[PDB]
């Protein structure tokens, strides 16, 4: 047993993975086995979702978080999000399961059978965390791989069938994207938008042309950065700004992943373009707007004048003005007037919601969509009772948007905590006091008194 | 040497579980309180006292099981098994809420036995009895909430039932009927509990992050030996850190640990005083100046007036099922509601 | 070089209060939030929080005391829109729509995040182990949950916690109405965290105070038996361990002071992490357990439980909260 106890390694069993910091072969085994775990969950969870999938029922009523991802890519769906073939879901699941067997074999082999350190076996695969050139080279390889993955998404959108477009004319449909937005003004203006209400930063991307053009830019930028880090050594300011150790690199990745988890939470909660409501259910804003639309339709059919109807407070019961003048839905859903959805945009004119198109141009499919989205709002209990907390036990529903947003907020927060833990520990270990204060050379004893 | 002295020697013998003289009071009473709660939440209904299911046998889960209080018509009856209500019948005694008074009385005497155990072990070991003095605050909470509060009210019915969701009902009842959040004694209790949690976290983190390096292990727990004489962490470094971060810092370890004793104990005692006041319905329900102003001025709104409307909703919507002995029949038109919803 | 002198002063450990770079951000933001909070709590005009032209007065000069006073959250018409002073046409409009709340909470959240960073920074400058900021991340996560994450999930800063005592109680009651937080396991873990934190605080304090070594006479305070900076331990750890091991049993007692103090740090911090996550996950409307009409008799009659009584209380709160703001049957946000 090499480095497999506390006396030789300095780490207890509950920090036992920290014994792998300077064992590149076993660390590679741990990483490859964990990657096998991720791919295993993807495949097994897809097969589990498919085995209980009822294709006529909406996906968001069935507790599905992975089939909507495949369906958004355009695999197995037709117009309106209707499932036309479940076989691509099966293919994705089984290919992930088999690939996870391969990755698990490799992880187990490098973890318990392969060489403990890769430096003697290969200068290419061996590494030292203090060697900044090798770290940037490995980072460059992985940047090229990520750029290729982004270009694979582009290739799916442009050549291999397209993507599901919820904004397609005549309901959502699978559409081939033939003119991606390559203008850097649009792409980096998304990057420079405010994160607050009405702006939404990158969460507010509302068409697939911008999505595909952004992934073209992301793939090219990642490939160029990968070549840049393969061919170049870190500069002096970078060498003086960072801690160069394995725990430090881990803490940097933990902070990045925490930020990405928060962004993914906001993306799945607000965006209905890359998370179409046909698959993930309506957003919270979408469902509130749908309720207002539903009761506007019902009362207009009863003969009410929805433009002049006055609520209890004197604001319009159905229609009011946003603070910048736009005609919006009344009630509490005044907070959600920045919502844009394909079932609502036919009723919008230049000044917001249009009274004449409200009176004359509301189609039965829009009324159906509003009722369906109102009654499948992302509200439910932990034991999956649909509705507000005061609802009785009859509806078994929690929206996949709720599950994804809550789970990834939990993960993002804990990864921020992990970033703080490892960044502090990497700093203390680089300076040499992560094990405690030296009794003979305590720094505060050499400092003057505060008062 | 005398039978009393021999029994004393046996009771104070070193064992895995210390018994002592206090054990005679503690172990039967604590065991019976715990066993009564487990038995009641596993097998015993509340159908005749509250009209509720409250056991696993009826289909409740861990959150919704409770040993419920007796019916309001019992008054403050001790509800002894041999008493005039049950008349020796165990089944009727369970159906009438006798397990509640069983658990409450045996728990009270078990708490007495545990504080006496703290005193006895402190006397034998040779330490000061500050742990028993600190345990006086949970005893004050239990006596004020489970005994004094229902004694001030009409019956045992309005005491908390021994269950998770039943305690949640008790919380919401105190909000709706007593406005217990507005009570300054409850505010002092909250300050004591949250300050105790803060002090616990901050003292633990401060000690763990000002440790001296006393070993080469990267896990520092092995660098402490219980028989060592030196302090395991730097008080000077901790003091300078908190003086520069927060402005003030402890400089006396004994004062720090007494303060850690003092904050949650004082908070719990203040909340117990407030609960005594609520036993007599001496509530901090309302501010009279705000209510005079709101009565004369229909445009004056505060968060306190909104809370009063919420309390009215709680009372009117909760009372027919929470107090079934009153036979409240509130028709739909008398229920206070906002627009829509 | 002026920049080198400024860097030396900022990172100096000889300042009475450490600044650091996190403090370079923290001091102006917390000063701005504090000054605006004091001014708004004393003298702000009423705020139309629900966006229904029904202004709520929260300042002392407009008829409040310390208990009922608050800085009222910004208007529901604003929602999540960024509302600085320069976005308003006048200061009267900014005050009417609850702009001070957005100013205070944004400056406070930035300053408190930089307070956490500053705690790390000073621990690094003093040669300390760095994880006090990790412990402080639990109340900071709680503040982020009630001031930022819950408004984001619900779509309006009007649903953030008001900056006042009675406003806090209003937030709690409406939150229980809409999300059944008492039945949420993360809030139950938080209650276990704070109750256990108070318990273990009282326990550790009483056990250390109980085992203090005699250094003083009966007239003086026992606290004078400890001298600041002394090397010897001021109490007998073995005697406290012997007491607490006889109080329960030997293996429920810490004989290791480092493990004990790690437990004291870890229990309330993890509990408060879980309750802050509970507030955030209920911000995305993943509510507490719903056992309404769970117990059904043989015929099909509903047998009520304590959860049904809780549901009655929640219904009372739900139908009375924001009594003029709802036009439609479902309170969807």
């Amino acid at each position: 047993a090499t480095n497999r106890d506390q006396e030789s390694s300095g780490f207890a069993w509950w920090a036992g993975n920290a014994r792998l910091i300077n064992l590149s072969g076993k660390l590679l085994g741990a990483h490859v086995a964990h990657a096998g775990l991720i791919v295993f969950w993807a495949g097994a969870m897809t097969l589990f979702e498919l085995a209980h999938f009822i294709p006529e029922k909406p996906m968001y009523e069935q507790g599905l978080i992975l089939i909507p991802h495949i369906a958004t890519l355009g695999w197995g769906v037709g117009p309106g999000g209707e499932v036309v073939d479940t076989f691509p879901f099966f293919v994705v699941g089984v290919v992930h399961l088999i690939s996870s067997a391969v990755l698990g074999f490799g992880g187990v082999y490098h973890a318990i059978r392969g060489p403990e350190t890769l430096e003697e076996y290969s200068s290419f695969f061996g590494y030292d965390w203090k060697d900044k050139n090798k770290m940037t080279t490995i980072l460059g390889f992985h940047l090229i791989v990520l750029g290729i993955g982004a270009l694979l998404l582009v290739a799916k959108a442009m050549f291999f069938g397209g993507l599901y477009d919820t904004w397609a004319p005549g309901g959502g449909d699978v559409r081939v994207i033939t003119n991606p937005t390559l203008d850097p003004r649009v792409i980096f203006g998304y990057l420079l938008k405010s994160p607050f209400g009405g702006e939404g930063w990158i969460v507010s991307v509302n068409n697939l042309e911008d999505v595909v053009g952004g992934h073209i830019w992301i793939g090219l930028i990642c490939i160029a950065g990968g070549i840049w880090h393969i061919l170049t050594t870190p500069f002096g300011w970078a060498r003086r700004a960072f801690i160069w150790s394995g725990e430090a690199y881990l803490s940097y990745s933990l902070g990045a992943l925490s930020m990405m988890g928060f962004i993914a939470t906001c993306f799945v909660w607000f965006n209905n373009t890359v998370y179409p409501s046909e698959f993930y259910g309506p957003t919270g804003p979408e469902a509130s707007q749908a309720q207002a639309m539903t009761f506007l339709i019902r009362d207009q059919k009863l003969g009410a004048n929805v433009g002049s109807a006055q609520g209890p407070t004197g604001l319009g019961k159905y229609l009011m003005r946003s603070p910048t003048g736009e005609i919006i839905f009344g009630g509490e859903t005044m907070r959600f007037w920045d919502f844009r959805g394909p079932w609502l945009e036919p009723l919008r004119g230049p000044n917001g919601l249009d009274l004449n198109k409200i009176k004359n141009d509301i189609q039965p499919w829009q009324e159906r969509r509003a009722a369906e989205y109102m009654t499948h709002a992302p509200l439910g209990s932990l034991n999956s009772v649909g509705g507000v907390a005061t609802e009785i036990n009859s509806v078994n529903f929690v929206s996949p948007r709720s599950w994804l947003a809550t789970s990834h907020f939990v993960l993002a927060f804990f990864f921020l905590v992990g970033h703080l833990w490892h960044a502090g520990r990497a700093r203390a270990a680089a300076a040499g006091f992560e094990k405690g204060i030296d009794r003979e050379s305590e720094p505060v004893l050499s400092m003057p008194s505060l008062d | 040497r005398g039978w009393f002295d021999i029994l004393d020697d046996w009771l104070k013998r070193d064992r895995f579980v210390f018994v002592g003289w206090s054990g005679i009071l503690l172990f039967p009473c604590a065991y019976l309180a715990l066993g009564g709660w487990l038995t009641g939440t596993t097998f015993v209904t509340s159908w005749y006292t509250h009209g509720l299911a409250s056991s696993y046998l009826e289909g409740c889960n861990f959150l919704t099981v409770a040993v419920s209080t007796p019916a309001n018509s019992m008054g403050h009856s001790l509800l002894l098994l041999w008493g005039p209500e049950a008349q020796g019948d165990f089944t009727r005694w369970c159906q009438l809420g006798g397990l509640w008074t069983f658990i409450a009385l045996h728990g009270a005497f078990g708490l007495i036995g545990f504080m006496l155990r703290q005193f006895e072990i402190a006397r034998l070991v040779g330490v000061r009895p500050y742990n028993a003095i600190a345990f006086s605050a949970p005893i004050a909470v239990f006596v004020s909430v489970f005994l004094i509060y229902p004694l001030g009210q009409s019956s045992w019915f309005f005491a908390p039932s021994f269950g998770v969701a039943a305690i949640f009902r008790f919380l919401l009842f105190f909000q709706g009927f007593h406005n217990w959040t507005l009570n300054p004694f409850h505010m002092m209790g909250v300050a004591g509990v949250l300050g105790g949690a803060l002090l616990c976290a901050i003292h633990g983190a401060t000690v763990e992050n000002t440790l001296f390096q006393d070993g080469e292990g990267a896990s520092t727990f092995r660098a402490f030996n219980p028989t060592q004489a030196e302090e395991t962490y730097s008080m000077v470094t901790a003091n300078r850190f908190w003086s520069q971060i927060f402005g003030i810092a402890f400089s006396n370890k004994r004062w720090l640990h007494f303060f850690m004793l003092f904050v949650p104990v004082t908070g719990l005692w203040m909340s117990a005083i407030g609960v005594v006041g609520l036993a007599l319905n001496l509530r901090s329900y309302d501010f009279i100046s705000q209510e005079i102003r709101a009565a004369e001025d229909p445009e004056f709104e505060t968060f306190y007036t909104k809370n009063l409307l919420l309390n009215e909703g709680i009372r009117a919507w909760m009372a027919p099922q929470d107090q079934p002995h009153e036979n409240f029949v509130f028709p739909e038109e008398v229920l206070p509601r906002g627009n829509a919803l | 070089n002026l920049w080198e002198r400024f860097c030396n002063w900022v990172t100096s450990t000889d300042n009475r209060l450490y600044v650091g770079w996190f403090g370079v951000i923290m001091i102006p933001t917390l000063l701005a939030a504090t000054i605006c909070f004091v001014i708004a709590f004393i003298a702000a005009p009423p705020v139309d929080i629900d966006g229904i032209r029904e202004p709520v007065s929260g300042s002392l000069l407009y008829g409040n005391n310390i208990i009922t006073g608050a800085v009222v959250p910004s208007s529901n018409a604003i929602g999540l829109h960024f509302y600085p002073i320069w976005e308003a046409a006048s200061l009267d409009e900014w005050l009417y729509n609850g702009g001070p709340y957005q100013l205070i909470i944004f400056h406070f959240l930035l300053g408190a995040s930089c307070y956490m960073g500053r705690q790390w920074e000073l621990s690094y400058r003093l040669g300390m182990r760095p994880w006090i900021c990790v412990a402080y991340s639990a109340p900071l996560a709680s503040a982020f949950a009630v001031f930022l994450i819950y408004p984001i999930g619900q779509g309006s800063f009007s649903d953030g916690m008001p900056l006042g005592i009675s406003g806090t109680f209003n937030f709690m009651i409406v939150f229980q109405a809409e999300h059944n937080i008492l039945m949420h396991p993360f809030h139950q873990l938080g209650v276990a965290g704070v109750f256990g934190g108070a318990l273990f605080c009282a326990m550790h304090g009483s056990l250390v105070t109980s085992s203090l070594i005699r250094e003083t006479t009966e007239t003086e305070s026992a606290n004078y038996g400890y001298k600041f900076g002394q090397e010897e331990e001021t109490y007998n750890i073995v005697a406290a361990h012997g007491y607490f091991g006889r109080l329960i049993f030997q293996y429920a007692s810490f004989n290791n002071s480092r493990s004990l103090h790690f437990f004291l740090a870890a229990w309330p911090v993890v509990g408060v992490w879980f309750t802050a996550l509970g507030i955030s996950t209920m911000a995305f409307n993943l509510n507490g357990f719903n056992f309404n009409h769970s117990v059904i008799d043989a015929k099909g009659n509903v047998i009520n439980t304590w959860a049904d009584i809780i549901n009655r209380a929640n219904l009372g709160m739900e139908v009375m909260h924001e009594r003029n703001a709802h036009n439609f049957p479902l309170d969807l946000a």
């Binding site: 004893l445 008194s449 505060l450 008062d451 | 000077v236 003091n239 003086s243 402005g247 003030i248 810092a249 400089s251 | 009475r16 209060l17 004393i42 002392l60 000069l61 005391n65 310390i66 001298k227 600041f228 900076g229 002394q230």
Partner: peptide, 30 residues
């Protein structure tokens, strides 16, 4: 009258904060 009382007590607390931070008993390390 009550507003003046609240502001006075709050200002006394802030003054006490100032004196407790900057005019404390100095921790003299022995």
């Amino acid at each position: 009258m009550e507003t003046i009382t609240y502001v006075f007590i709050f200002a006394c607390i802030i003054a006490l904060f100032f004196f407790a931070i900057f005019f404390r008993e100095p921790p003299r390390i022995t």
